[PDB]
Design a protein around this ligand. Structure first.
Ligand SMILES: Nc1nc2c(c(=O)[nH]1)N[C@H]1C(S)=C(S)[C@@H](COP(=O)(O)O)O[C@H]1N2
Ligand SMILES: Nc1nc2c(c(=O)[nH]1)N[C@H]1C(S)=C(S)[C@@H](COP(=O)(O)O)O[C@H]1N2
Ligand code: MOM
Ligand code: MOM
Lengths: 373, 373
């Protein structure tokens, strides 16, 4: 009776942590090999079966201020609104969960360093769609924009998330209703025919397979806006957790990881090129990446690849690399850490950020290797 | 021949690290005793002699888009523009420098935990003054607003700093040209008759004793915008430093400190109330403060005093407190650490953020005490 029979096929080289629903990340060897992650490798994160969508009978629902409903077809979304492109990294709340479970087991998909990818998205500006539906530039008080997807659970409830009205209306926030990804139409796994893209914020809020946009006095009433995607003290456990006591994750903290070489690898002597990525929420730029060969006692500054984005609008990761000298038969512990435009930094160790749900894993990334003789 | 004879007198209980120029902080016992720091205790940071200002012949200079100059008197600044009030914490770039020098000596004023204070500022909105001078809401490209103060060095050069045009024009950024502080007129030490207040950013940019506001394609050409107030890798030293390689500090990272009890104090048994402060740049709210009694192996969540500010506009610190049980003749290492609305956190230790200039000290704050028998 398989609810997943309809799912699309995937690239055979992904690291799959869950088949049903499908949740996988690119192999770390390939993760930072390009600045734009090819579509078929882009990390994929699904809560439910992937909806089968028939393009022409597709209608996106958008309720105007007055409770009247406007309803947009896919053709009309492409032609009513000037297409805008935005290059943005999506990062799973629980990227790097693995390292947290090493300290104490947590419940969640066991992502490694790869629950993150970058793509050039293209489509309508949400701000434009809303203005078109009749909304003003500014509402009085705290308002939220709610998205529902087409995928729902056994019992009817759709996946949903929300963002602050302000962020939705802002030209600089670049919030897209994308129908293109890396120059082609949105793949099924990635939200075909339409998804929201919220630059600078946790991946959880980029609703895929979009069916509705509502404006409201409150956050998305949904399970995943309300009872998931929050960070707690390392002391909080499954009996003590109170979801009303922490804000829903929106922006993410500064983050980086070593993608080459891999743990346990033996590398040749002379010169070693260490490569990785770094990124920060909030559209805040990565301004420096320090790398260590000795477990974080001494550091050197890595080189940042990529082109500078406007101030406040660094939605894309920075890729870094650092070529250094390595001795016959030494042991290296390779550490990296990133600093952003607000000078936020990454913490030394993992225990003090541990949280029962395994999200927000951004302590320094350590990689043990040896040098052959 | 004393260039400082003219300086105002101070409160006799301040912790002075430099008499000439005057640079002092409130005693830590008093630092967090109120939410608004009384004027006479507010940390004071001067590069130069304090200018003697004659109110009525005071003119603030403001150059309109066209290179023509408008020139505002103090009366006119009070009456042309609707007074707006903003409660904001100013924090020295080098707050908590002390802890950094403990690792390796640095050059700078040796601030302890107190180079920070909060006050309700009142005065003209910079955005309004600029619009009045003729500027538009939005300029094409990256533009900067430059401030000069009345205080200059032996050889003519005034203290100066700048902020992004965007931040200056934004209603939400609350950038004030203040003439009031905690309900009275600006004290001399604190900028009388006018100072800039930039919420959410390092104290360095709140030019006191304001004489000019210029709009420009570039940052403030001044020594302190260009060759100071930047963060470097812990590897960079006095011979290797390149000031063109890091951004000028604007927003600050998440920060907290224990203000009570004090290092080396012996406290009574039974119950101990630990009090402190926490704050974050960017108008990002402090959402949690964990406190440890055992040097940071186990944590408990402190209570946050204060009232929630609008989203994105938490310019004021949060004060926290936590009452816990303490045993006869134990040793405590009290640690605190804060997490903000973007979920940025504070790093475990200081060595890995060390920088040749001692700025950006935000590793966990440790406080050793004993419990009497
Ligand atoms: N409809 C729908 N949209 C969704 C999800 C989902 O399960 N259903 N998952 C969200 C989460 S938690 C993440 S991290 C991103 C993953 O985006 P990607 O699958 O394109 O990498 O999708 C977001 N949008
Ligand atoms: N004219 C002038 N303005 C100035 C300074 C200065 O030396 N001269 N110091 C700046 C710095 S570095 C700081 S931290 C703040 C201190 O503000 P406070 O002295 O009111 O606490 O003033 C800022 N504005
Ligand atoms: O679960 Mo989505 O934030 O990876
Ligand atoms: O030097 Mo001012 O940032 O304390």
């Amino acid at each position: 009776q398989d609810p997943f029979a309809g799912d699309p096929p995937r690239h055979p080289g992904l690291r799959v942590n869950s088949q049903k629903p499908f949740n996988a990340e690119p192999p770390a060897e390939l993760l930072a090999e390009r600045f734009l992650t090819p579509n078929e490798l882009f990390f994929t994160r699904n809560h439910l079966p992937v909806p089968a969508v028939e393009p022409s009978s597709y209608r996106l629902r958008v309720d105007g201020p007055g409770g009247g409903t406007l309803s947009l077809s896919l053709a009309e979304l492409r032609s009513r609104f000037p297409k805008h492109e935005v290059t943005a990294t999506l990062q799973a709340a629980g990227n790097r969960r693995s390292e947290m479970s090493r300290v104490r087991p947590v419940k969640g998909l066991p992502w490694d360093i790869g629950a993150i990818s970058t793509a050039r998205w293209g489509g309508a500006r949400l701000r434009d769609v809303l203005l078109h539906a009749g909304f003003p530039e500014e509402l009085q008080g705290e308002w939220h924009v709610c998205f529902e997807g087409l995928d729902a659970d056994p019992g009817g409830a759709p996946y949903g998330a929300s963002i602050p009205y302000g962020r939705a209306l802002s030209p600089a926030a670049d919030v897209l209703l994308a129908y293109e990804m890396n120059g082609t139409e949105l793949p099924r796994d990635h939200g075909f025919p339409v998804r929201v893209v919220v630059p600078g914020v946790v991946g959880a809020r980029s609703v895929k397979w979009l069916r509705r946009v509502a404006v409201s006095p409150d956050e998305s009433p949904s399970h995943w806006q309300q009872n998931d995607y929050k960070g707690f003290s390392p002391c909080v456990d499954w009996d003590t957790v109170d979801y009303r006591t922490a804000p829903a994750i929106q922006e993410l903290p500064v983050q980086s990881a070593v993608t080459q070489p891999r743990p346990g690898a033996a590398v040749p002597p002379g010169e070693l090129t260490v490569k990785g990525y770094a990124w920060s929420g909030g559209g805040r730029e990565v301004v420096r990446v320090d790398v260590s060969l000795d477990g974080g006692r001494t550091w050197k500054v890595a080189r940042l690849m990529g082109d500078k984005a406007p101030p406040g609008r660094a939605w894309a990761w920075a890729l870094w690399e650092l070529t250094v000298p390595v001795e016959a038969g030494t042991e290296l512990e390779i550490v990296c850490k990133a600093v952003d435009s607000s000078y936020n930094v990454q913490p030394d160790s993992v225990a003090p950020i541990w949280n029962l749900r395994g999200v927000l894993s951004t302590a320094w990334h350590r990689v043990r290797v040896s040098v052959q003789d």
